[PDB]
RNA sequence: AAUGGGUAAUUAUAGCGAGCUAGAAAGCCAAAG
RNA sequence: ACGGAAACGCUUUCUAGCUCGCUAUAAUUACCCA
């Protein structure tokens, strides 16, 4: 059997938010206790049309009043005197900060995203999300996979070409397909009592500040052990998983000196293991070939929200401190994760 | 109201009847309505157009009631979506579902709005 | 003599699988790669064609001394089990892989499951310009299970080849535990545990008590 | 009356070349799962046996037990087919032969 | 418009009238339009060319209305399919179905587009 | 500065679109007479 | 007191064999607006 497995022990330092596309709006959650209750809004409006309130509730959603605590749907269940709390959905506890340090402004989060969940509702990290993190470590370190993932002359700085890495049917030829020979399996469904909804904190250079954003990202608490079973079938893939001890160091060495250099140092976490950058909030420079995207990635922004000062502002969040941050005021990195492999 | 033989030509007319940015002559005759606000509306209906195939109508009538919530709510936020639900008679058509085959007719009606919006500019 | 025996086994899913279906009139802003379904119950189905297609290609690396390049270049231990079209005595071939249907529709309704097919958004990220390309593929859910029927013929040629063929069938089923039943596989989507491997007779007379010792070894 | 649109499903299906891993797809049509088909026979008794009647049905009921185990037509070693014979009832239409003494063989 | 005696010679002319990649001389005179974007259009019509045989026309007029949705929608995404529905007068022919025998004539018209596209390069 | 808010983009891309084996045999008849 | 009378184009026969809907793909990017 050429199926030599592995066991990639993913440990999160920064909170990791990944997938599901959808997002709750600012009328789809309840903050009464220190938890955010996200109801099943099909069961909300059904239970509330039975209380003869759907005429006022439709008028409640077109109501743009100041003092945003009186807009976030706790005030609808306060002013209309409803205390049953029997609705579909779940609850996640508060981050602790998860607003910009104002006690009166609590519950003033507006749009959370939704972390990826199976049909049982439990969160998990899929293997397809974890494999896109390995593929950046494997593309960036390999010299052959950096010389020209060119714009092909068919677009403006258009695409990796999709042919730098050999893949396909290749009629007449054999079938190598290196990344078919790396089979990242999905993680076990863990519990949604590890989810905290960190808020984005854009810390830019040349304007030494950390202007927050109205994005929430239900994401995993730090110091969480998540396991992936990665099997390989080829000698060519059996080397490249074994070389993650060299390349994930050499990627972060190549990435600290490229982008994390010229940022102030106290925000940046320490590794403690082999580092990896998982989805949703690790900037564009960890989802890319970071040394072949300097004149190409900034083409996409002739807008009001442009990526000024070349490389975009470092993406930080706020979450409670455990065991790490290496700076006061709780500045994590949104995706600074750590793994170590072992073969089974 | 929309039958099966007209609901795409209704949605073709509603995009044309929708206004454009007559000022700001930088690629002009563009809409005030944007693609991402429009795809937030279809993201509600597209997850019912495929649970109409699987499930009964007798279980979907909780979220079909919720489409009148959020088509109103998205209309209240931005004035561009406010014009869409007036021109494309969506709030009229949403109160007229009553079975599976109109739910799929309305959810194909929202896809016709996205299609011609992508087509016309 | 003539006997037909039956492998009443049970597929259990782990990180449940995708098995494609075209469904052209599917949607626009929704599922563009649907799972194949029973057209009357709309439940996820493991067809036998993708169960039989793995077990020739997974056993081609074990029971072919010479590399195949085609079916009907296999090594007469796969041919007498599955079948050829360019051999003479091994065309109809000792395995009827019946389809597997979603068995625990009540256990999934006992737990908190809304729909039997979860939908996952997947986002091919371009590695320059970082610009996205989402897809919504549809897969069966994690703790689904399937009634896996399999019928074995014993004609007037299986003198002692019944035991030799069952070293093969419990070499392809315990190798699908190491492989992925089609779909994407290299991104999860496949691992399965064949619970309750249990032979039985449905026609003829053949002692199966010497068979339920290597199936459950 | 159920959710069936068409009485024939079209499953999509391919094959992978063993070297070069190329797909070759096919769309084969297929009757849907929960159909019921009216099945009848005509067993004539031409007065040329006079004792073989009671043991021909032991072959016929055995023949319908084998189609419920084999596949009845088509690409059946990859899943398809699998008929199921229900509600068997032998009733004489012409002639005078006692079938209720025989209807226990069909059960 | 397309009759029975010309709709293949119409589709033969429309592929020739469609433009080619005049630059990028690596197997040149290739189309901007690709095979996989073209087979996504025929995958709509091929599942009606075989339900025209089975079913009535009186049940297919919900999806025949939907072909004007997605031939517009696929034209809005990529500019190569945008040229196909202009050269091959598809949006004109799709509004002219009205019975079974033109539905099968249009669905054989889409197969003639795929045939000559595979033929000419 | 507070405060009120998110905003735009992508919605699958590239392929394969079936291949091979069988294409009517044996009786009647005719032949052998 | 019809080149007519009498005469089943009939019996036997699985549209069948073999075939993974597959291959690659992080729900992600930008950070501002009033």
Distance CA A24, CA A184 (A): 30
- HSE, side-chain direction, 13 A CA sphere, residue A79: 12
| CA-closest candidate to residue D71, choices D82, D62, D63 | D82
What residue ranges do the domains of chain E occupy? 1-121
Interface of B with E in 87-106 (CB under 8 A): 101, 104-105
Distance CA D33, CA D4 (A): 11
C129 touches strand F (CB under 7 A): no
- E46 to chain C, any CB pair closer than 8 A? The answer is yes
Check if the beta carbon of residue E114 is closer than 8 Å to that of residue E43: no
Q: Which residues of C49-83 are buried (b: 16+ CB within 10 A; e: fewer)?
A: bbbbbbbbbbbbeebbeeebeebebbeebbbbbbb
| Residue C195: strand pairing partners | C10
List chain D residues with CB under 8 Å of E48.
none
Name the method of structure determination. cryo-EM
| Residue D26: strand pairing partners | D13
Query: Which residues neighbour A169 within 8 Å (Cβ) at sequence distance 6 or greater?
Result: A175, D20, D21, D22, D23
Instruction: Indicate the pairing of strand C117-121 with strand C136-140.
Output: antiparallel
Instruction: List chains adjacent to chain B, taking adjacency as at least 3 C-beta pairs closer than 8 Å.
Output: A, C, E
Across the interface, of B43, B65, B72, the residue whose CB is closest to A46 is B65
Q: Which residues of C96-110 are buried (b: 16+ CB within 10 A; e: fewer)?
A: bbbbbbbbbeeebee
Q: How far is the CA of D85 from the C1' of F15 (A)?
A: 44
Distance CA A182, CA A230 (A): 7
E37 touches strand F (CB under 7 A): yes
Closest-CA residue of chain D to A169: D22
Query: Which residues neighbour A253 within 8 Å (Cβ) at sequence distance 6 or greater?
Result: none
Check if the beta carbon of residue C142 is closer than 8 Å to that of residue C13: yes
| CA-closest candidate to residue C113, choices A36, A300, A117 | A117
D10 touches strand F (CB under 7 A): no
Distance CA A303, CA A315 (A): 20
C86: number of Cβ within 10 Å: 11
D3 touches strand F (CB under 7 A): no
Distance CA A128, CA C185 (A): 10
The nucleotides of chain F lying under 7 Å from a protein CB are 2-21
Positive/negative CA dihedral, A196, A201, A202, A204:
negative
Check if the beta carbon of residue A3 is closer than 8 Å to that of residue A51: no
- A146 burial (CB, 10 Å; 0-12 / 13-18 / 19+) is middle
Interface of C with E in 2-61 (CB under 8 A): 22, 24-25, 28
Distance CA A291, CA C191 (A): 37
The nucleotides of chain G lying under 7 Å from a protein CB are 14-33
In a 3-state reduction of DSSP, which class is residue A337? strand
SS3 percent helix, strand, coil of chain D, rounded to 5, is 20, 15, 65
Q: How far is the CA of C129 from the C1' of F9 (A)?
A: 12
Measured in degrees and rounded to the nearest 5, phi and psi for residue E3 equal -95, -175
Q: A304: which nucleotide lies closest, measuring CA to C1'?
A: G32
Give residues 286-325 of chain A lying near strand G (Cβ < 7 A): 286-287, 301, 304-308, 312-313, 315
Q: How far is the CA of A269 from the C1' of G33 (A)?
A: 31
Best to test chain C binding among B35, B45, B53, B107 (most C CBs inside 10 Å): B53
B43: number of Cβ within 10 Å: 16
DSSP string across A117-165 = B-TTS-B---HHHHHHHHHHHHHHH-GGGTS----TTTSSS----S-SS
In a 3-state reduction of DSSP, which class is residue D86? coil
Query: Which residues neighbour E92 within 8 Å (Cβ) at sequence distance 6 or greater?
Result: E1
Structure tokens at D58: 């032991």
Check if the beta carbon of residue C162 is closer than 8 Å to that of residue C215: no
Give residues 66-85 of chain C lying near strand F (Cβ < 7 A): 85
- A20 to chain B, any CB pair closer than 8 A? The answer is no
Distance CA C158, CA C141 (A): 40
- D29 to chain C, any CB pair closer than 8 A? The answer is no
Q: What is the resolution of this structure in A?
A: 3.4
| Nucleotide F7: closest residue by CA–C1' | A305
CA distance C23 to chain E (A): 9
Q: How far is the CA of C52 from the C1' of F28 (A)?
A: 46
Closest-CA residue of chain E to B111: E69
Across the interface, of C49, C95, C203, the residue whose CB is closest to D65 is C203
Distance CA D18, CA A27 (A): 55
C20 touches strand G (CB under 7 A): yes
Distance CA C101, CA C47 (A): 8
DSSP string across E35-88 = HHHHHHHHHHHHHHHTHHHHS-STTTHHHHHHHHHHHHHHHHH-HHHHHHHHHT
Check if the beta carbon of residue A37 is closer than 8 Å to that of residue A30: yes
Check if the beta carbon of residue C187 is closer than 8 Å to that of residue A181: no
D14 touches strand F (CB under 7 A): yes
Check if the beta carbon of residue C200 is closer than 8 Å to that of residue C37: no
Secondary structure of chain C as H, E, C letters: CCEEEEECEEEEECCCCCCECCCCCCCCCCCCECECECCCCCCECECHHHHHHHHHHCCCCCCCCCCCCCCCCCCCCCCCCCCCCCCCCCCCCCCECCCEEECCHHHHHHCCCCCCEEEEECCCCCCCCCCCCCCEEEEECCCCEEEECCEEEECCCCCCHHHHHHHHHHHHHHHHCCCCCCCCCCCCCCCEEEECCCEEEEECCCCCCCCCCCCCC
- A213 to chain B, any CB pair closer than 8 A? The answer is no
């Amino acid at each position: 059997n050429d199926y030599r497995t592995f066991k990639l022990s993913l440990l999160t330092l920064a909170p990791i938010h990944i997938g599901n596309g959808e997002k709750y709006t600012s009328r789809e959650f309840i903050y009464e206790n220190k938890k955010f209750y996200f109801p099943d809004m099909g069961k909300f409006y059904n239970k509330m049309v039975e209380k003869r309130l759907a005429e006022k509730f439709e008028a409640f959603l077109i109501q743009t009043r100041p003092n945003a605590r009186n807009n976030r749907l706790i005030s609808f269940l306060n002013d209309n005197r409803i205390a049953e709390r029997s609705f579909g959905g779940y609850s996640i506890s508060e981050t602790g900060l998860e607003s910009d340090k104002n006690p009166n402004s609590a519950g003033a989060i507006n749009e959370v995203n939704k972390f990826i969940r199976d049909a049982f509702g439990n969160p998990y990290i899929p293997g397809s999300s974890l494999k896109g993190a390995i593929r950046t470590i494997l593309m960036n370190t390999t010299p052959k996979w950096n010389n020209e993932n060119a714009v092909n002359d068919f677009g403006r700085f258009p695409k990796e070409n999709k042919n730098l890495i050999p893949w396909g049917p290749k009629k007449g030829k054999e079938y190598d397909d290196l990344f078919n020979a790396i089979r990242v399996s999905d993680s076990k469904p863990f519990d949604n009592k590890s989810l905290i909804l960190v808020q984005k904190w854009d810390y830019s250079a040349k304007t030494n500040k950390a202007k927050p954003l109205p994005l929430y990202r239900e994401s995993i608490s730090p110091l969480t052990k998540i396991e992936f079973e990665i099997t390989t079938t080829t000698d060519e893939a059996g080397r490249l998983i074994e070389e993650l001890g060299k390349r994930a160091q050499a990627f972060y060495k190549d990435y600290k000196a490229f982008f994390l250099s010229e940022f102030p140092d106290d925000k940046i976490q320490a590794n403690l293991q082999y580092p990896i950058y998982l989805g949703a909030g690790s900037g564009a420079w960890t989802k890319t070939l970071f040394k072949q995207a300097d004149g190409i990635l900034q083409r996409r922004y002739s807008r009001m929200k442009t990526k000024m000062v070349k490389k975009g502002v470092l993406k930080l969040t706020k979450a409670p401190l455990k065991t790490l941050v290496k700076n006061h005021e709780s500045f994590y990195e949104m995706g600074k994760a750590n793994f170590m492999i072992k073969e089974i | 109201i929309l039958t099966d033989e007209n609901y795409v030509d209704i949605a073709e007319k509603a995009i044309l009847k929708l206004e454009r940015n007559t000022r700001n002559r930088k690629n002009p005759d563009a809409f005030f309505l944007t693609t991402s606000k429009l795809r937030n509306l279809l993201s509600l209906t597209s997850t019912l157009f495929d649970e109409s195939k699987v499930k009964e109508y007798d279980a979907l009538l909780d979220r079909i009631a919720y489409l009148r919530v959020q088509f109103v709510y998205q209309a209240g936020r931005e004035i561009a979506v406010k014009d869409l639900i007036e021109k494309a008679q969506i709030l009229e058509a949403l109160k007229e579902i009553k079975d599976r085959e109109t739910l799929q007719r309305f959810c194909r009606y929202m896809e016709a709005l996205v299609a011609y919006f992508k087509f016309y500019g | 003599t003539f006997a037909k025996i039956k492998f009443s086994a049970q597929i259990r899913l782990e990180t449940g699988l995708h098995i494609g279906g075209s469904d052209a009139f599917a949607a626009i802003g929704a599922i563009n790669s649907p799972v194949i379904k029973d057209p009357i119950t709309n439940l996820p189905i493991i067809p036998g064609s993708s169960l039989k297609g793995k077990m020739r290609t997974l056993l081609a690396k074990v029971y072919n001394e010479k590399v195949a390049e085609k079916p009907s270049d296999d090594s007469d231990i796969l041919s007498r089990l599955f079948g050829n079209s360019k051999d003479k005595r091994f065309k109809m071939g000792r395995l009827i892989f019946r389809d597997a249907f979603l068995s625990n529709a009540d256990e999934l309704d006992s737990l908190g499951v809304r729909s039997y097919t979860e939908v996952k958004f997947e986002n091919t990220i371009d590695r320059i310009t970082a610009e996205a390309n989402p897809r919504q593929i549809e897969r069966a859910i994690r703790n689904s299970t399937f009634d896996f029927e399999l019928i074995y013929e014993i004609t007037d040629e299986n003198e002692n080849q019944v035991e030799e063929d069952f070293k093969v069938i419990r070499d392809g089923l315990k190798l699908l535990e190491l492989d992925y039943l089609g779909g994407s596989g290299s991104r999860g989507y496949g691992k399965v545990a064949f619970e309750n491997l249990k032979a039985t007779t449905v026609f003829g007379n053949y002692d199966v008590k010497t068979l339920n010792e290597l199936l459950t070894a």
